Each structure stands twice: as C-alpha cells, then as structure tokens.
Design a protein around this ligand. Structure first.
Ligand SMILES: O=C(c1cc(-c2[nH]ncc2-c2cc(Cl)cc(Cl)c2)c[nH]1)N1CCOCC1
Length: 332
C-alpha cells in the first residue's frame, strides 16, 4: 500500500500531498493508464460524501468537475476507505485571487463559466449552496469547473421559510442576507448571491462582505447596499426578522463605482442585479447569462441544461456508498 496510507493500487503512483479536504486527504498522483497527473481524495461527514458522489456521477458538464474513477475494497466487509479520482487542476480562484490581479477579460470569462455551470446545476433542480472562490477550479488555460457539492440540495422554495437567526452551514462570507433573516437557503436565489460576492471579489482581490460572525455578515451587507426599502421589508413576514431590521440605524447605499473605481460599468450593473437584497427581485441565472456584460460569450444553444431533474443508520449509509461506487470496480 502506497503511503503519504493512500493505497490507490498500482494504476496511481508518485503521490504528492495537495491539502486536506472535508472527509480526508487530497493528493496528486500519476495515472499510469492516461499518462497524466490526477487529483485523488481519500475518504475515511458521511452523508455529504454520498450526496456529492451521487450528484457528480449524474452531472455531465464542461464547467462542473467530474469523477474519473472511484477506488474501494471489492466487498462491504473489507471497505474502509474510498478514493475519488479527478483531473488535476492547476489552481483554484481562491489561490489565484491571493496573488494575481485579474484583467477585465479574465473576470468576464470566469463569470461566464460560473453562470454556465450554475445554469445546468439549477436546470437539474439542484442548489450548490457553497459557491466561493476555493470551490472553483482552474486549469492552465483558465477553463473553470465548479466543485464541492457537499452542501448541495434539491430546490424547495415552498419550504424555505424559517425564524430569525436560524443556524446555517454554508461559508459565512458568501451567505445571502435572507439566510440570517427568514430563509433556509432552499431557493435558487441563494446561489446567485454567492456568484455576486465572487464577482465583487474578482474586481478587488478581497471578499466584499467579510463578516466575523453570523449577524456581522448582515451588517457588512447593509453597510454597502444601505437600509432595505419599505417594500423589501414588507416581503419579510417574520416579525422578529423584520423588527431587527427596523431597529438598525439608517445606512446609506455605497455606490458600486465608488467601491470598484476601475471596474467595467456593465460588470457593475450585473453585480448590482446579483447583490439585490430582495431575493425575489434578484436576477436569475439565465438573465445573468443574457446580461450585456457577457455578450461576447452568450450562446444559449451552447449552454446545456440537464436531461432530468435530480432527486434523492451508519450501516445503510456505508451500503449506499458501496452501491453508488460499484460501476468503477475492475470486474467489468
Ligand atoms: O486539483 C486540485 C484539487 C483539489 C481538490 C479538492 N480539494 N478539496 C477536496 C478535493 C477533492 C478532490 C477529489 Cl479528487 C475529489 C473530491 Cl470529491 C474532492 C480537487 N481538485 N487542486 C487544488 C487547487 O489548486 C491545485 C489543484
């Protein structure tokens, strides 16, 4: 067994540590069949693993990461670790933004691919719910792939309401304001907010709303968008959430061109539509693709949608992971 314990059999060799994923270790390895280096995640936090495997195996899209192979023991009794193989990417948007200034051409291309991938995700009635720069992979030619479906769910807008200050799992800085107020994040509008945050981050190389805690996140958002309007407050029926907003001092809107003085005016018009406080008035993925900022790339005949809507104890969980990974077994 290969050590870094990463027994990926004889096919994958010359292992190098990349970092640490949620359920385990990520390494690069040399694929001896395809004669290229690949990424491998070792999975040794259980439910998220099965959900993501199911989604990634079902989806087939240029801007969504795919699973090349899955390594595991031939029997349920012997199965301990599960290894997921993917193409080795050059970097991610998080690492790129830490050291590289993006040209308007790069921002435009990255945004287009994010939305193209998101169109397909949403067409499958799925919400990613954790879009952020570290979940956007890039190769040496800037082709972008969305990864990490660990928090993804089937859209359920009829069961989206909840009380004020409901605990949320997704990365704080990319959370839409309704999550802190009255939303479970069961609607498509939640992903568009995260894309809007990513666009603002590509424009200045810094997160636009770096909240330090749950409620600080909301005050960061309102410090730029300004106090919500009466109309936008009327949409919030939950009295505790609406009264919290009414208790705050008036905050002025910070004009986008003041925050981003070197940004393209069309990029700011699209940003404004994505970072709309009211989720019902927030732009949808297909309108965002049709926005004049992305006119060079927009081609709905080359922006595929999914063929069908996607639909979903410890012993049963292990058995389901065994069953979902059976297609990669060498006995076929
Ligand atoms: O190729 C990867 C890469 C890392 C990951 C990764 N990070 N966290 C988890 C995983 C991951 C890897 C694989 Cl191979 C499968 C799954 Cl499900 C998840 C995926 N691809 N990278 C990381 C960013 O810069 C260098 C290139």
């Amino acid at each position: 067994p290969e050590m870094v314990v990463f027994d990926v059999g004889p096919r994958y060799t010359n292992l190098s540590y990349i970092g640490e994923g949620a359920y385990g270790m990520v390494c690069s390895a040399y694929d001896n069949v395809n004669k290229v280096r690949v990424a491998i995640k070792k999975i040794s936090y259980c439910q998220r693993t099965l959900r993501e495997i199911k989604i990634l195996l079902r989806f087939r899209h240029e801007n969504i990461i795919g699973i090349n192979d899955i390594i595991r023991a031939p029997t349920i009794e012997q199965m301990k670790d599960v290894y997921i193989v993917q193409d080795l990417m050059e970097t991610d948007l998080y690492k790129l933004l830490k050291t590289q200034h993006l040209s308007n051409d790069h921002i435009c291309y990255f945004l287009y691919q994010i939305l193209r991938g998101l169109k397909y995700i949403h067409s499958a009635n799925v919400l990613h719910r954790d879009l952020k720069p570290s979940n956007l992979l890039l190769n040496t030619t800037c082709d972008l792939k969305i990864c990490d479906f660990g928090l993804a769910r089937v859209a359920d807008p009829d069961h989206d309401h909840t009380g004020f200050l409901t605990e949320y799992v997704a990365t704080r800085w990319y959370r839409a304001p309704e999550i802190m107020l009255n939303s479970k994040g069961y609607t498509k509008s939640i992903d568009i907010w995260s894309v809007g945050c990513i666009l603002a981050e590509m424009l200045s190389n810094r997160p636009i709303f770096p909240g330090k805690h749950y409620l600080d996140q909301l005050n960061h958002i309102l410090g730029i968008l300004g106090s919500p309007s009466q109309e936008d407050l009327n949409c919030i029926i939950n009295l505790k959430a609406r009264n919290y907003l009414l208790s705050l001092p008036h905050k002025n809107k910070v004009p986008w061109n003041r925050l981003f003085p070197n940004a393209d005016s069309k990029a700011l018009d699209l940003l404004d539509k994505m970072l709309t406080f009211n989720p019902h008035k927030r732009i949808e993925v297909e309108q965002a693709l049709a926005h004049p900022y992305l006119e060079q790339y927009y081609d709905p005949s080359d922006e595929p949608i999914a063929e069908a809507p996607f639909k979903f104890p410890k012993e049963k969980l292990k058995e389901l992971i065994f069953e979902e990974t059976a297609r990669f077994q060498p006995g076929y």
